[PDB]
Subunit: 115 residues, 4 copies
């Protein structure tokens, strides 16, 4: 599993469950093409977005719908979404774990890249 995302809620100290996200890949003509999508599970994780074969070199964008997450909890948050944009697999295949830590007016994002 070459691309996984984990989302935590910094207010409750819990996984952020049922958070929707879409992944995009930059095409040769510079547009963002839809690549994969999913929502976080009860553990705050989203697995199975792609395969080693499909996940070729390129620039990818993960757009995490954090606004809908907060709104369903009654909160009007600052950010519309949390976006993570990165070049992947430039030196060969790697495994990427993207973590997002959510607060109503702040988010943090971290990448763990393994070989």
């Amino acid at each position: 599993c070459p691309l996984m995302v984990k989302v935590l809620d910094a207010v409750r100290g819990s996984p952020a469950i049922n958070v929707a996200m879409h992944v995009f890949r930059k095409a040769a003509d510079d547009t963002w093409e839809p690549f994969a999508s999913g929502k976080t599970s009860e553990s705050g994780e989203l697995h199975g977005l792609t395969t080693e074969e499909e996940f070729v070199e390129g620039i990818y964008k993960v757009e995490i719908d954090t606004k809908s997450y907060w709104k369903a909890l009654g909160i009007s948050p600052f950010h519309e979404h949390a976006e993570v944009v990165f070049t992947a697999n430039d030196s060969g295949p790697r495994r990427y774990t993207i973590a997002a830590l959510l607060s109503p007016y702040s988010y943090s994002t971290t990448a763990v890249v393994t070989n």
Copy 2:
């Protein structure tokens, strides 16, 4: 000053100086219209992006060129950039300070919204 950005470098323990960024407003056709840009000062701050009259309600994106910053320092970064996307002034004009804390494989962004 309705919109200010402050950037810190978590590797060196300093303001992040000469960080370039662009501010976009979302157009009617859902494309991003650039409208302001600048680079952070010796204090890591960028002021004077817009004015209260011009800074009307809408969705705004700040794209911070973190990759160029880390490249200029000889340090390999993960992200292409750090984006902050938010709806402004939904309850009337506010002063926004966007605070970004940068590491090569992680960043955080926080909004301090004052009235």
Copy 3:
């Protein structure tokens, strides 16, 4: 001002106001000798803790009373406090700004060290 602390609230998107903290210096017997304290202003900042003459090399601890802050806001926190422990002035006097970003179940602390 050799030592300043700035605290932000990631839930409300604001300076964290009236946050109490104590500064300790490590004694010869490895106990913590209190020597300064204060509470953050309307801007979330605490200035005037020490002076350049008094702020000699040594190990210092800032204990930020985050639990009281969250309790005063009616929000359940995880931590008893946020501690920052550091050796000061190891290469000669520096100006230290300690920046703390607070959420109920997460915090970050960053040092901006200028010369």
Copy 4:
């Protein structure tokens, strides 16, 4: 497993391996008593510190030796250590995952508490 710690390196985008930490519990007389210790594995995780039976209610402190971690990589970091202090099990037994994200001049810590 009621108490686990995970440590990541924000510079390299990797688990922080072989990071030492000590856990303490506040005694009835207010002193910190040694509770458990260990070092992070190749995955940046430390498991098996305690048991459900042993991990009674109380105030606990995790002192993570982040300075030694950075020094072994050639870096003189800001913090002496990263300390996480918290009341545990106040409403019955819970499972605690403490995460720490390390940069030379910044650290973040998060708690995920599950029932």
